[PDB]
């Protein structure tokens, strides 16, 4: 049965804007990473880019570096996949015409790290 081992390719998609924002997994208290990088390993639990709702009065309770690391199974919206799996592809779309930024600061580094490369690729593709 080790020689009969099929391969499964899966795709998980999520959104985070004015309604809700991301969570801080896959890292310590000095870095922010809402999703694993290309060529990384998923956690022993299958939660990838868990989403927390957007509130204002719960800022010292929920918008603290202790609560951004832990995941509540209720009052949240996570995405469960495969625990042991390698990340192959990442595609990020972004609306960048809104004058209020709904996401707080310090959470949009890994997003723009892929978005700038994708925008440069599509810009060269249109320039040709």
């Amino acid at each position: 049965l080790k020689r009969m081992m099929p391969t499964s390719y899966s795709t998980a998609v999520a959104n985070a804007g004015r309604k809700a924002f991301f969570l801080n997994m896959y890292g310590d208290d000095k870095i922010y990473k809402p999703f694993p990088d290309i060529g990384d390993v998923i956690r022993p639990d299958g939660v990838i880019f868990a989403i927390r709702d957007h509130d204002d009065d719960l800022a010292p309770a929920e918008m603290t570096p202790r609560a951004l690391r832990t995941l509540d199974r209720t009052f949240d919206r996570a995405v469960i996949g495969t625990p042991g799996a390698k990340v192959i592809d990442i595609d990020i779309w972004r609306d960048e015409r809104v004058n209020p930024s709904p996401t707080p600061t310090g959470m949009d580094a890994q997003l723009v790290k892929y978005h700038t490369h994708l925008s440069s690729y599509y810009r060269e593709l249109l320039k040709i």
């Binding site: 009969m4 995405v79 469960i80």
Partner: protein, 121 residues
């Protein structure tokens, strides 16, 4: 190897309810499915009415159609010193029979028509 390996399994001790416990959306927020499985059809409740007595087969539907009994079974699971082998979960002295949601909906819809389904010797 062939198609249809074992991955389309489901297990749910508690499911979200309708604003009556049916949900159909992009349900990928839990490891495995959390949807309620319609194990009791019309032929299933007919066989459970004939083989099992008509008394104890209404409690299985009343533990689902009534949200108070659905809260009471979890309260009895969480308040007992033994989670298994609990004698009584929903006693009929505090939460009696007659609080089913589709039964009361049908009774209200027939009451606005002007008639009622009762009996008398």
């Amino acid at each position: 190897l062939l198609e249809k390996i074992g991955e389309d399994w489901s297990a749910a001790a508690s499911v979200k309810t309708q604003p009556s416990k049916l949900n159909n959306a992009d349900r990928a927020s839990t490891p495995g499915r959390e949807t309620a499985i319609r194990s009791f059809g019309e032929s299933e409740t007919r066989s459970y009415n004939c083989t099992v007595g008509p008394g104890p087969t209404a409690e299985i539907l009343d533990q689902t159609n009534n949200p108070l009994a659905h809260a009471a079974v979890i309260e009895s699971w969480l308040t007992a010193e033994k989670p298994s082998s609990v004698p009584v979960a929903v006693d009929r002295e505090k939460i009696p029979f007659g609080g089913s949601r589709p039964v009361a909906m049908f009774d209200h819809l027939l009451e606005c028509s002007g008639i009622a389904l009762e009996y008398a010797p």
